[PDB]
Design a protein around this ligand. Sequence first.
Ligand SMILES: O=C(O)c1ccc(Nc2nccc(Nc3ccccc3)n2)cc1
Length: 267
Amino acid sequence: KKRQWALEDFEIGRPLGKGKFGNVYLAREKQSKFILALKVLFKAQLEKAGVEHQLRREVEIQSHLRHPNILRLYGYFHDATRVYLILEYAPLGTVYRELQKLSKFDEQRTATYITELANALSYCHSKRVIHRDIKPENLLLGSAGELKIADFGWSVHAPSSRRDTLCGTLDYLPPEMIEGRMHDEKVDLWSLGVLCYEFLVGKPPFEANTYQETYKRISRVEFTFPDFVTEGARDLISRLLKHNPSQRPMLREVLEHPWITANSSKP
Ligand SMILES: O=C(O)c1ccc(Nc2nccc(Nc3ccccc3)n2)cc1
């Protein structure tokens, strides 16, 4: 914003998470008593990994996004050693931990998460921003249990040519991305299909024991449903996981989906 913060402005609390490049802490701003989360990253690690520009990309995009379903970035600042991102704080945790805890979601919590998500993504895409990292570990919970997309680390503007050496799990990545081609916002809808399935089933539909094998699964779009996935969930997920991006529906079609409406508690 208009202001320049510094570490001495904040009391750091209990650590929320420990990433590869740094950790997230609860923290309070001394003068306002304001509660939020401080993301501490290391110039050393960011440098060695050559992500500095991608970090820039994160800060710009996220800082400029306002939406109930997106985690706000208020600002940032650096010192000799590390980099500090000042983030809105989501008091109920990741969707990942919800999923470990419950191991499966009912159609209603899933349709709801999928709705909030679709809305969020909608807002993003209207700006030509594609997230590309949508996974439950990157999804957080607000005071009211409402879903918030955090961690804009891999997002970019569309279309993208990006071949970025793929670091983590392919589990949420569409064929066009793993295969090194150019991609557009449809990426996120593929991901939404992956997410939907993981929410209902407890594991992402392409899970394998090796990168190479999972990569095969995604490329050939090989998945199957447990018997307890209702036909409506199957239809939404099947429409969402299409080798052809242009065959994948649009967030309007998702929000307007019969299964979504018969289930979601949130418009
Ligand atoms: O008690 C926990 O588990 C937990 C509690 C709150 C929380 N909220 C939060 N808010 C803003 C950013 C952020 N980053 C983050 C993302 C994933 C894991 C850890 C931190 N987390 C995360 C975890």
